[PDB]
Ligand binder design. Structure first.
Ligand code: IWE
Ligand code: ZN
Length: 256
């Protein structure tokens, strides 16, 4: 699976027919159609930098994975009664600065998007159990607007040189990804899906109102990762953002 013409978002529905389901992600958030929900509590994140484990080139992207054997690193609040356990963060980007976010806001496309992913450790005992459950996953999305270089990305960007080709992996330790979140945690929430196969409709999306910055040159560092395995002809990871999907009657709630 990838973002090419023959393995990309338009091809996913042949093995994953949920791609055409009613709770698919990402979406365009129309702010005139959001419903302010008074019952939404503030997002609370409390992550232990010691849970940072590994950075991996997965061919179409890179993932930073976390130790998830215990509740050292948790998300609570917002729409949730259950505590969610941090397990990964990653980014999405586009071929040029003009697009690359997954979510849009009032049709506006940003240059990239951060995803911070968690699984419901109150109700389930593993990511594998949680992955397919309607209440199983919680992902914070942060829209990334091209502009000033973001110094909080530095450890992540410095690590990429050790995972240049598909399947390379390296230790990635002592990192608290709450340092990447915007200063305001005002958010939108809706019920949706993984944005990559297998596209399970198991994700409660938390989309931050406030963007964070990224430079043109930092985006170029993402696009210079290689989708090929070592020794093959180099094939840059140009883009990995899924198009926005129909809301199909879902309501986006606003904390603000
Ligand atoms: N983009 S996203 O909706 O945040 C997302 C994307 C992926 C992905 N992207 N590439 N490969 N996997 C993912 N992988 C881990 C899994 C969890 C459960 C089953 S597989 C988890 C999340 Cl939440
Ligand atoms: Zn993602």
């Amino acid at each position: 699976w990838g973002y090419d013409d023959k393995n990309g978002p338009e091809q996913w529905s042949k093995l994953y027919p949920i791609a055409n389901g009613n709770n698919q992600s990402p979406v365009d958030i129309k702010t005139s159609e959001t419903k302010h929900d008074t019952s939404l509590k503030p997002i609370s994140v409390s992550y232990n930098p010691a849970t940072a484990k590994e950075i991996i080139n997965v061919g179409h992207s890179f993932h930073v994975n976390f130790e998830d054997n215990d509740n050292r690193s948790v998300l609570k609040g917002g729409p949730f009664s259950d505590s969610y356990r941090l397990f990964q963060f990653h980014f999405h980007w586009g071929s040029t600065n003009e697009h690359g976010s997954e979510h849009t806001v009032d049709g506006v496309k940003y240059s990239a998007e951060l995803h911070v992913a968690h699984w419901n450790s109150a109700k389930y005992s593993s990511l594998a159990e949680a992955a397919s459950k309607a209440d199983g996953l919680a992902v914070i999305g942060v829209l990334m607007k091209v502009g000033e270089a973001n110094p909080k990305l530095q450890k992540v960007l410095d690590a990429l040189q050790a995972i240049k080709t598909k399947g390379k992996r390296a230790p990635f330790t002592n990192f608290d990804p709450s340092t990447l979140l915007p200063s305001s945690l005002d958010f939108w929430t809706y019920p949706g899906s993984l944005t990559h196969p297998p596209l399970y409709e198991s994700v409660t999306w938390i989309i931050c109102k406030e963007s964070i910055s990224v430079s043109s040159e930092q985006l170029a560092q993402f696009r210079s990762l290689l989708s090929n395995v070592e020794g093959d002809n180099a094939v840059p990871m140009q883009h990995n953002n899924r198009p926005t999907q129909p809301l199909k009657g879902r309501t986006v709630r606003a904390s603000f």
